Design a protein around this ligand. Structure first.
Ligand SMILES: [Cl-]
Ligand SMILES: [Cl-]
Ligand SMILES: [Cl-]
Lengths: 449, 449, 318
């Protein structure tokens, strides 16, 4: 038997006298606990708001609120997806409730010294949708764990080792490049940025090959970013690599008819007697040059050569994900990512995917007039203009390295990848796993078309 | 009938199965609501922790937690003070529960556009203690209201008007000095600091004369402090005046055999074409001079002449209360006030009073070697050394103005007067009314001896 | 008695004044060994693999960025029925690490402890005293301690490094575990620990923390005899909330006001249950960067040497 049962209630739905006396008015995520009818167990009444305004995000948030209110129970049954009357179809309700339950239960206690809850059950006939939601949420929590991991544990070599182990679990193809084998690939930005650190850099390629469409995902894996010699105005700057790895791990379970390759440059950015210097010039894999005008804009320099490699003459589409710029957050706020692409059809695909996933993105323009801020007196471009517009300038910088004719999108997720404000809804303090579920929904949509 | 009854539970005390299933373990301030035995009402089980470790502060905090958990109820009965088994005597339990209930219910909604709770009842035979606690808490909430009030509403003239109205309610004697009548008193610091503002300064004396001991209380009433021309590194810098006024309003109800006089300089510190200048010299009521080296250290300059007036050849003791220095907070933190006095017996009286009231103070030394940091090249002293130790230097500065032989204490309450972190226990966000209850307990102790 | 106390103070002044390039952690350990030999104080110096064996994780983590390796020294006066442990912070150069400061004088606590120990054979107190001295540099480097790293201490508890400039408390943690382990009747630590202290206390007064009122009075009266200024600050229970971490058992920096009190509470966690303890935070008065006055020079002052000696004298009588 369930120790606790969570009942979804839209505004106007009947609850008992005790629930009314406690102030239950079905506000989204409001929870009031009471004894079960027979007095042997617990019932949670959980608000879903007005039936007419409810979305999948309402259900996701209500499930997370339910799991947070479980107390010392061993078993919890969520009946939330059985609540009908909203416009959210049964399968969408089931998927969202399953996701919210896993996301809301997430804890990162690995590094504390010194959970009665053994089973969460989602009630619904939509078993496929439950499975899909659990898998998406489990992938999100993998990314959360990677971001939360101290940089001393998750070094570039350790991260490469972890990716290899994850790949083995579905027999994703995995190649790890290190030392002389890495030098051979000509990823000059990665090796230049990574050299100051005592930890050597790594490059990992991770392939799902279950198709007619091949998608390349590029994820920024800076495991610790101190700003280098220039300083910042630090373990979470591998959030892009975390999102890409996690999305790839979810694909074998979903069984999408789509080939997907992950490209993952891993490094630390540290000050040191041998660190990358202001004024240095990097000669990239495509023969073009970048002048290092600020060592804290290292991400774009690392990604450059990987985008050349990923788009070389073959992937039909390349998507990069990176915690790239701080300028983004000033106008967009802390919970919204930035999307760049020249392809309007790809923009709509990514944006609709983010809406299904409950993740907030804003498309920003690849402004031609900001290219003047890439100009260098010495090299082909700079990595920092010291002027306003760095979020757009970084996107334009990356665009230079994507081979002619290859559709491309760039996701700048610096702010929403790490929550330094309190927990809310299904999102914890700290590493969030932001963009995992957007990526999965994007890949699902691309596989259909 | 009570809609809600709050039951105090020490660790190990019996609660029903539902309460156990919800995780009730009697942690201090933990609340679990359940149906009453007959199913017609609500019971709150409220944690009081181990009987052996419980203090009056435990009861105060539990009462505040209870009132926050009332929901939409019209009537609440707190049975918390009936819980025995701790070392806290019945009268102390009753006083603390009454205080915590009022303090925990506090809201400041005067300036919002657009409470079903009509009665809170404290169950106990200790009716005198309940009355004492309600009165102390009501005085605290008066101070909270004054601090929370926007500076545009609570100007120096408006504040003087409010004090006059409060005084009238018990026929405390009240004299308000303004314009030419104020100029006659020779409070040079007050008039110099206040001149930049469009609002004119005020000085108010408020006397409780129901005795053989006469106590003077001096409260800093800067209703808005911009830092003046020097700037800060702002409505809450009248927290000292608020505490003094509120303590005085509580005395007629308590009926202490003690004469108490309040001395309240009120002003704004603003930049302006006619504002106090760096390098200006103030000639005080005692003939000594102060050089203005920083216009943001205006509080000590305002208080100086009032301390001369208050201690002049008569008050047996003078206590000043002021939100004086920011340096305090760096080592003491945001919830602890600083106490200065040369009189060890007075220090113990104030500290024991603060312990009874549940307010945190630390005695700091009047360090003779910090007097060298008061030296000026032009006047008798400076108002700012630009060196470390300003909290101690400010206390030494004030000490200069207290007439020879008069016992004196100074309370620097800058940090705990305003809570800019979240609410906790019986303390809200914003104006706290800090030091009201310490002052009342100090005056009670002095009246006995 | 006065000449000996003053000579010990001047030893501490010399150690603090010494350039960090001369007084490296290995060089400091060598100097302590030589000083110990002069009265045959027992002296053990731990380095390399022998140091790793002691499990002083904070010391080895903080010290790793520097080209200079860390050292740990134990120095014992055993001439008694009372045994006192003294713990002295010996950061020979503190750059702030990767986080930066808002630098050779951050071994003033170790200097005071060493100097006090050297004075005991002359005075002949009937008291056993053990010094515990972690020595390291805090430097930025490709291999330096990172923000977000977690240190697992000798007692099994964990600390999250939220600011690399609060390295002193992290170094002291494991030494306090070792010094108070199941035996010393009392442990006193001395450290140039926090800058927040000085803001309200000024540049010539140290901060004293202890839960034991009788020990507080002993230390304060000793400081009065010695002519050194201390102020007792409270171990505020409500400041413990500022030690909370989202990842580890505690943080080394809250980024909030009250760091002097928070540092004392941090250290308190590592002192074994039931062992009386006091903490002296001497950051400001250990180095005089204002002019000379009275008996105090510009620069290294040897602050707390004479307070420690007077404290040990009082404890030896009772
Ligand atoms: Cl970048
Ligand atoms: Cl002031
Ligand atoms: Cl520290």
């Amino acid at each position: 038997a369930a120790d606790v049962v969570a009942c979804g209630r839209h505004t106007g739905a009947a609850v008992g006298a005790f629930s009314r006396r406690r102030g239950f008015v079905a506000r989204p995520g409001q929870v009031v606990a009471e004894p079960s009818a027979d007095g042997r167990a617990v019932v949670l009444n959980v608000g879903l708001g007005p039936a007419g305004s409810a979305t999948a995000a309402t259900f996701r948030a209500a499930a997370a609120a339910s799991v947070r209110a479980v107390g010392p129970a061993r078993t919890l049954r969520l009946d939330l997806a059985l609540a009908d009357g909203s416009g959210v179809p049964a399968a969408e309700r089931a998927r969202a409730v399953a996701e919210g339950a896993v996301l809301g239960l997430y804890r990162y206690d690995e590094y504390r010294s010194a959970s009665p809850l053994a089973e969460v059950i989602v009630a619904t006939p939509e078993r496929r949708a439950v499975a899909e939601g659990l898998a998406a949420a489990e992938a999100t929590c993998l990314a959360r764990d990677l971001v939360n991991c101290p940089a001393g544990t998750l070094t570039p070599p350790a991260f490469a080792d972890r990716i290899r182990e994850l790949a083995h679990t579905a027999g994703l193809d995995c190649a790890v490049y290190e030392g002389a084998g890495l030098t051979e690939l000509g990823l000059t930005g990665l090796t230049a940025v990574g050299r100051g650190s005592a930890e050597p850099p790594r490059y990992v390629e991770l392939t799902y090959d279950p198709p007619a469409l091949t998608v390349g995902l590029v994820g920024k894996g800076v495991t610790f970013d101190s700003g280098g010699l220039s300083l910042k105005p630090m373990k979470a700057d591998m959030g892009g690599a975390a999102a890409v790895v996690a999305a790839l791990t979810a694909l074998p379970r979903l069984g999408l008819p789509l080939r997907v390759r992950g490209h993952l440059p891993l490094a630390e950015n540290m000050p040191d007697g041998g660190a990358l210097r202001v004024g240095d010039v990097v000669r990239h894999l495509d023969g073009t040059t970048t002048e290092i005008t600020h060592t804290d804009n290292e991400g774009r320099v690392v990604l450059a050569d990987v985008l050349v490699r990923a788009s070389r003459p073959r992937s039909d589409l390349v998507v990069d994900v990176a915690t790239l710029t701080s300028a983004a957050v000033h106008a967009l706020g802390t919970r919204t990512g930035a999307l760049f692409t020249p392809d309007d059809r790809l923009a709509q695909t990514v944006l609709a995917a983010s809406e299904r996933a409950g993740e907030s993105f804003c498309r920003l323009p690849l402004l031609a007039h900001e290219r003047r801020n890439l100009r260098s007196a010495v090299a082909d471009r700079v990595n920092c203009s010291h002027r306003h517009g760095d979020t757009i300038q970084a996107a334009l910088f990356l665009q230079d390295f994507v081979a002619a004719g290859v559709p491309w999108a760039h996701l700048d997720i610096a702010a929403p990848a790490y929550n330094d404000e309190g927990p809310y809804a299904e999102v914890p303090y700290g590493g969030t796993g932001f963009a995992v579920r957007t990526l999965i929904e994007t890949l699902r949509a691309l596989s259909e078309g």
